[PDB]
């Protein structure tokens, strides 16, 4: 119906991964996406904001908004080239645990839902 989800210890992060999509031998860097939208870009727009550093990088990427327990890139600018999983996007595509997220060809991203598929 229409009630929502709460669960801020078990909220959507995205763990920056190889600039071929693999996992480093090292800690990668972590973003929970908590609730409200986040835009994304080398811009300072929220006070908890995703702040990417890279050649080809826009301000204004996109901004993740986590709508009950489910989050959809939306790229506000067209040339921030945005990849979900090797594909790119034209509007809000929802985001699954486990899909890549290239920004810029570059700062390669996987996004895991601690909150569960569903159930389980």
């Given at each position: 119906?229409?009630?929502?989800?709460?669960?801020?210890?078990?909220?959507?992060?995205?763990?920056?991964?190889?600039?071929?999509?693999?996992?480093?031998?090292?800690?990668?860097?972590?973003?929970?996406?908590?609730?409200?939208?986040?835009?994304?870009?080398?811009?300072?727009?929220?006070?908890?904001?995703?702040?990417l550093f890279g050649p080809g990088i826009q301000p204004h990427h996109c901004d993740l908004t986590n709508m009950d327990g489910v989050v959809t890139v939306t790229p506000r600018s067209m040339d921030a080239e945005t990849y979900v999983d090797g594909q790119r996007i034209s509007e809000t595509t929802m985001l699954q645990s486990g899909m890549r997220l290239q920004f810029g060809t570059s700062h390669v991203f996987k996004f895991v839902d601690p909150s569960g598929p569903s159930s389980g």
């Open positions: 119906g229409s009630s929502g989800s709460s669960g801020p210890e078990k909220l959507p992060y995205l763990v920056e991964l190889s600039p071929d999509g693999s996992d480093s031998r090292d800690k990668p860097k972590l973003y929970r996406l908590q609730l409200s939208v986040t835009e994304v870009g080398t811009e300072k727009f929220d006070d908890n904001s995703i702040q």
